[PDB]
């Protein structure tokens, strides 16, 4: 199951 | 992803504690939170947890997670009666998912320092039965009769706090005298 | 024995030629499972692996959201980092993120990993204790700020600690057959030449799996190491590795160099003379 | 904030409507949900950003666009009864840290059949009992507006012309006067307390305001009876001393 | 940094002429990740070439695998034509099944 909180560099 | 908020209400004296289960059902969610709904007004966000915690506390808000029974809770004490208020249990499945759950009806009841009940009837400025002054342990039962109508408790505050509930019928002979027929003592006035 | 899930992303800006070209793959041990990629027909995650192909299609809902979450999170940092660096809108650059964890023999927890690279150098990674982060140079910085202040690692914690591995144990398990195995290598030896003077000896390993191999030549009980040529671990294409160690050696020496091969499935590693 | 338009609407099965949806926080992800008694809220669709929409629970009925990341229109493209409920539009900024997502208004729609259904209410207010005032010390006036249909009303009390607060109570939600009855009209109450003797001043003048949302200035209206059009409708009462 | 692929071509079973295998070109190492790969037959390009995701080892670099279906023979000579910005020209790497 993927990560769900990415966020902009 | 279902969440599943069983028990639609819940009412708690002031002062005491009041506990607002949730479960779940997808493996797939990771994030957990509670919002808090007022009448007429959006869903509020009231507090979070993450996926491996098991307990997390903003003043008076106390949220439990358990995974092994994929179960949420929030503890709300001590409960004051500006916490009424429909809470929504939630969680995400990614940030750009959310789930939402069927919600409970808080009712924190006002403490009533010296309460008489009684039923009054108010005829039209130009008759309706009220019964107040109660104690927030009576539960106020509707209509009986499909041509009689009764409304919810609610609770009315000054800058004293008291309990109504009104009925009304376009019959004959009605008489506040019955109307409230279901739960309740005293005061039947002349 | 241990075991990892591990997911990597690509996205190479195309300026002018289009939207960034976005590559997303995710791995259990040495087997790639799922995939994504910009210019495919789909716009779905898809499986490529069997085991997988059995969830649910909430499975690849959910996972074709989140992962279009990545694609677009590295087509705004594409162009933020343009601006960090002061660089071309005209050039074509990458950026790329690794990330997974790691469970001992126990199943449970080990490490976690989350690692970005922007032109091919490390740009930013979180520490292995799951709460700060090492920034390369001064734009690094400006994200680790920007990160701190949300809290990101928090949520990376929660998700390498908790749910990554409670995904791969479900991966292990259901996929049980293919991921919990041992392919030892099926070694053998050859004899090139094409001299009266010099034959090169070959020694090889076959269908192995997973890819850690150790291959070294000695002579007369002396490491090999600089006169031996390695290649480099390959894929064979169905789900185990090849690799080969070759040594020149002038006639009549045969006899006095030996292979030696060390791999998992190896219960005591191997010794292969040219008899 | 999240800003919604219309709070209240009435349509006749086959009318299209849209809902409007801004946000001036520069968020990039907004949704549509709508709350209903059995199962709390359900998305109809989202949209992770400009340009780019995606279907949810129940999408079935609504399409939705997203040309600008400020506004994210809701639209019906031919009403039916089932879509009868409480829209909320929501926000958040995910890829930033903003996961947690914030809630508009919310827009009350009702759905009818025939728009002969639609009926404004008739609003009395019942003044206070003898024997309260006589027992307790206190007044209780109570205000009740009947007979309307759609469910959308706000009722308000003034005294002395300027509004009032304090003392009031008012139900939550109308109750439907007729049950078996699918078209039903509704029925609302509401209590204002004060002291006897504010109320045995006859200079105090107490005032129940209704306000009703019904027909607009376009909607069609071939009938004898007045155009239920949305119009507020009172009744008072007078400080006595009896 | 610009680093240049390092190629090998071969098929994943034992070469054995008339038998159906599978014929492999593996390039990795390289920076960035734009690369043409072809995999021919006497000169000419084979038609239906597949390859793997892109990926990309613990020093970023990216490796693919180029696959094509084919019966080995005494007389027909396979090979790899790769070409990337570190490569002056097209690097041709011929398949020799003793490596």
Same mark, same amino acid.
């Given at each position: 199951?993927?990560?769900?909180?990415?966020?902009?560099? | 992803?279902?969440?599943?908020?069983?028990?639609?209400?819940?009412?708690?004296?002031?002062?005491?504690?009041?506990?607002?289960?949730?479960?779940?059902?997808?493996?797939?969610?990771?994030?957990?939170?509670?919002?808090?709904?007022?009448?007429?007004?959006?869903?509020?966000?009231?507090?979070?947890?993450?996926?491996?915690?098991?307990?997390?506390?903003?003043?008076?808000?106390?949220?439990?997670?358990?995974?092994?029974?994929?179960?949420?809770?929030?503890?709300?004490?001590?409960?004051?009666?500006?916490?009424?208020?429909?809470?929504?249990?939630?969680?995400?499945?990614?940030?750009?998912?959310?789930?939402?759950?069927?919600?409970?009806?808080?009712?924190?009841?006002?403490?009533?320092?010296?309460?008489?009940?009684?039923?009054?009837?108010?005829?039209?400025?130009?008759?309706?039965?009220?019964?107040?002054?109660?104690?927030?342990?009576?539960?106020?039962?509707?209509?009986?009769?499909?041509?009689?109508?009764?409304?919810?408790?609610?609770?009315?505050?000054?800058?004293?706090?008291?309990?109504?509930?009104?009925?009304?019928?376009?019959?004959?002979?009605?008489?506040?005298?019955?109307?409230?027929?279901?739960?309740?003592?005293?005061?039947?006035?002349? | 024995?241990?075991?990892?899930?591990?997911?990597?992303?690509?996205?190479?800006?195309?300026?002018?030629?289009?939207?960034?070209?976005?590559?997303?793959?995710?791995?259990?041990?040495?087997?790639?499972?799922?995939?994504?990629?910009?210019?495919?027909?789909?716009?779905?995650?898809?499986?490529?692996?069997?085991?997988?192909?059995?969830?649910?299609?909430?499975?690849?809902?959910?996972? /074709?959201?989140?992962?279009?979450?990545?694609?677009?999170?590295?087509?705004?940092?594409?162009?933020?980092?343009?601006?960090?660096?002061?660089?071309?809108?005209?050039?074509?650059?990458?950026?790329?993120?690794?990330?997974?964890?790691?469970?001992?023999?126990?199943?449970?927890?080990?490490?976690?990993?989350?690692?970005?690279?922007?032109?091919?150098?490390?740009?930013?990674?979180?520490?292995?204790?799951?709460?700060?982060?090492?920034?390369?140079?001064?734009?690094?910085?400006? /994200?680790?700020?920007?990160?701190?202040?949300?809290?990101?690692?928090?949520?990376?914690?929660?998700?390498?600690?908790?749910?990554?591995?409670?995904?791969?144990?479900?991966?292990?398990?259901?996929?049980?057959?293919?991921?919990?195995?041992?392919?030892?290598?099926?070694?053998?030896?050859?004899?090139?030449?094409?001299?009266?003077?010099?034959?090169?000896?070959?020694?090889?390993?076959?269908?192995?799996?997973?890819?850690?191999?150790?291959?070294?030549?000695?002579?007369?009980?002396?490491?090999?190491?600089?006169?031996?040529?390695?290649?480099?671990?390959?894929?064979?294409?169905?789900?185990?590795?090849?690799?080969?160690?070759?040594?020149?050696?002038?006639?009549?020496?045969?006899?006095?160099?030996?292979?030696?091969?060390?791999?998992?499935?190896?219960?005591?590693?191997?010794?292969?003379?040219?008899? | 904030?999240?800003?919604?338009?219309?709070?209240?609407?009435?349509?006749?099965?086959?009318?299209?409507?849209?809902?409007?949806?801004?946000?001036?926080?520069?968020?990039?992800?907004?949704?549509?949900?709508?709350?209903?008694?059995?199962?709390?809220?359900?998305?109809?669709?989202?949209?992770?950003?400009?340009?780019?929409?995606?279907?949810?629970?129940?999408?079935?009925?609504?399409?939705?666009?997203?040309?600008?990341?400020?506004?994210?229109?809701?639209?019906?493209?031919?009403?039916?009864?089932?879509?009868?409920?409480?829209?909320?539009?929501?926000?958040?900024?995910?890829?930033?840290?903003?996961?947690?997502?914030?809630?508009?208004?919310?827009?009350?729609?009702?759905?009818?059949?025939?728009?002969?259904?639609?009926?404004?209410?008739?609003?009395?207010?019942?003044?206070?009992?003898?024997?309260?005032?006589?027992?307790?010390?206190?007044?209780?006036?109570?205000?009740?507006?009947?007979?309307?249909?759609?469910?959308?009303?706000?009722?308000?009390?003034?005294?002395?012309?300027?509004?009032?607060?304090?003392?009031?109570?008012?139900?939550?939600?109308?109750?439907?006067?007729?049950?078996?009855?699918?078209?039903?009209?509704?029925?609302?109450?509401?209590?204002?307390?004060?002291?006897?003797?504010?109320?045995?001043?006859?200079?105090?003048?107490?005032?129940?305001?209704?306000?009703?949302?019904?027909?607009?200035?376009?909607?069609?209206?071939?009938?004898?009876?007045?155009?239920?059009?949305?119009?507020?409708?009172?009744?008072?009462?007078?400080?006595?001393?009896? | 940094?610009?680093?240049?692929?390092?190629?090998?071509?071969?098929?994943?079973?034992?070469?054995?002429?008339?038998?159906?295998?599978?014929?492999?070109?593996?390039?990795?190492?390289?920076?960035?990740?734009?690369?043409?790969?072809?995999?021919?037959?006497?000169?000419?390009?084979?038609?239906?070439?597949?390859?793997?995701?892109?990926?990309?080892?613990?020093?970023?670099?990216?490796?693919?695998?180029?696959?094509?279906?084919?019966?080995?023979?005494?007389?027909?000579?396979?090979?790899?034509?790769?070409?990337?910005?570190?490569?002056?020209?097209?690097?041709?790497?011929?398949?020799?099944?003793?490596?």
């Amino acid at each position: 199951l993927l990560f769900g909180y990415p966020v902009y560099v | 992803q279902q969440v599943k908020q069983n028990s639609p209400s819940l009412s708690v004296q002031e002062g005491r504690i009041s506990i607002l289960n949730c479960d779940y059902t997808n493996s797939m969610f990771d994030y957990f939170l509670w919002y808090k709904k007022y009448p007429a007004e959006g869903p509020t966000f009231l507090i979070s947890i993450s996926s491996i915690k098991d307990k997390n506390a903003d003043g008076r808000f106390t949220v439990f997670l358990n995974k092994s029974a994929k179960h949420l809770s929030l503890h709300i004490v001590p409960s004051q009666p500006g916490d009424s208020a429909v809470y929504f249990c939630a969680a995400m499945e990614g940030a750009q998912k959310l789930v939402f759950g069927q919600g409970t009806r808080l009712t924190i009841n006002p403490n009533i320092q010296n309460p008489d009940p009684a039923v009054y009837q108010l005829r039209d400025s130009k008759s309706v039965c009220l019964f107040t002054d109660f104690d927030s342990q009576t539960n106020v039962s509707q209509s009986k009769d499909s041509d009689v109508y009764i409304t919810d408790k609610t609770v009315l505050d000054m800058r004293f706090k008291s309990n109504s509930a009104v009925a009304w019928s376009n019959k004959s002979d009605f008489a506040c005298a019955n109307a409230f027929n279901n739960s309740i003592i005293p005061e039947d006035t002349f | 024995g241990s075991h990892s899930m591990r997911y990597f992303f690509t996205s190479v800006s195309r300026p002018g030629r289009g939207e960034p070209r976005f590559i997303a793959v995710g791995y259990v041990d040495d087997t790639q499972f799922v995939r994504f990629d910009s210019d495919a027909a789909s716009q779905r995650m898809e499986p490529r692996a069997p085991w997988i192909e059995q969830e649910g299609p909430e499975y690849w809902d959910g996972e /074709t959201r989140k992962v279009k979450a990545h694609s677009q999170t590295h087509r705004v940092d594409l162009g933020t980092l343009r601006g960090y660096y002061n660089q071309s809108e005209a050039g074509s650059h990458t950026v790329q993120r690794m990330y997974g964890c790691d469970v001992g023999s126990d199943w449970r927890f080990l490490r976690g990993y989350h690692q970005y690279a922007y032109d091919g150098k490390d740009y930013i990674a979180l520490k292995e204790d799951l709460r700060s982060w090492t920034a390369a140079d001064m734009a690094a910085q400006t /994200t680790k700020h920007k990160w701190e202040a949300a809290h990101v690692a928090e949520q990376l914690r929660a998700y390498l600690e908790g749910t990554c591995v409670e995904w791969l144990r479900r991966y292990l398990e259901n996929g049980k057959e293919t991921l919990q195995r041992t392919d030892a290598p099926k070694t053998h030896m050859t004899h090139h030449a094409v001299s009266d003077h010099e034959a090169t000896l070959r020694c090889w390993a076959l269908s192995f799996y997973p890819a850690e191999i150790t291959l070294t030549w000695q002579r007369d009980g002396e490491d090999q190491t600089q006169d031996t040529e390695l290649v480099e671990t390959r894929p064979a294409g169905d789900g185990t590795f090849q690799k080969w160690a070759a040594v020149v050696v002038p006639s009549g020496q045969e006899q006095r160099y030996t292979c030696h091969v060390q791999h998992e499935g190896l219960p005591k590693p191997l010794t292969l003379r040219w008899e | 904030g999240v800003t919604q338009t219309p709070k209240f609407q009435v349509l006749k099965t086959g009318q299209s409507m849209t809902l409007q949806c801004a946000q001036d926080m520069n968020h990039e992800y907004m949704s549509w949900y709508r709350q209903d008694p059995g199962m709390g809220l359900r998305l109809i669709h989202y949209s992770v950003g400009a340009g780019i929409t995606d279907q949810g629970e129940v999408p079935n009925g609504y399409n939705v666009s997203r040309s600008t990341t400020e506004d994210f229109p809701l639209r019906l493209l031919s009403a039916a009864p089932s879509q009868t409920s409480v829209y909320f539009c929501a926000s958040s900024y995910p890829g930033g840290g903003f996961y947690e997502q914030y809630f508009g208004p919310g827009t009350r729609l009702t759905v009818t059949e025939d728009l002969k259904n639609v009926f404004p209410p008739e609003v009395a207010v019942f003044e206070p009992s003898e024997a309260e005032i006589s027992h307790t010390q206190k007044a209780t006036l109570v205000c009740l507006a009947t007979g309307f249909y759609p469910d959308h009303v706000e009722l308000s009390w003034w005294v002395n012309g300027k509004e009032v607060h304090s003392g009031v109570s008012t139900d939550p939600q109308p109750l439907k006067e007729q049950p078996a009855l699918n078209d039903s009209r509704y029925a609302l109450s509401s209590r204002l307390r004060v002291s006897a003797t504010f109320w045995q001043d006859p200079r105090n003048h107490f005032r129940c305001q209704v306000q009703f949302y019904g027909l607009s200035e376009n909607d069609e209206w071939t009938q004898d009876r007045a155009k239920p059009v949305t119009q507020i409708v009172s009744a008072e009462a007078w400080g006595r001393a009896d | 940094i610009q680093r240049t692929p390092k190629i090998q071509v071969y098929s994943r079973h034992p070469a054995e002429n008339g038998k159906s295998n599978f014929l492999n070109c593996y390039v990795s190492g390289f920076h960035p990740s734009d690369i043409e790969v072809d995999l021919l037959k006497n000169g000419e390009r084979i038609e239906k070439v597949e390859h793997s995701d892109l990926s990309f080892s613990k020093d970023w670099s990216f490796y693919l695998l180029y696959y094509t279906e084919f019966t080995p023979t005494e007389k027909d000579e396979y090979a790899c034509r790769v070409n990337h910005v570190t490569l002056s020209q097209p690097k041709i790497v011929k398949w020799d099944r003793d490596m």
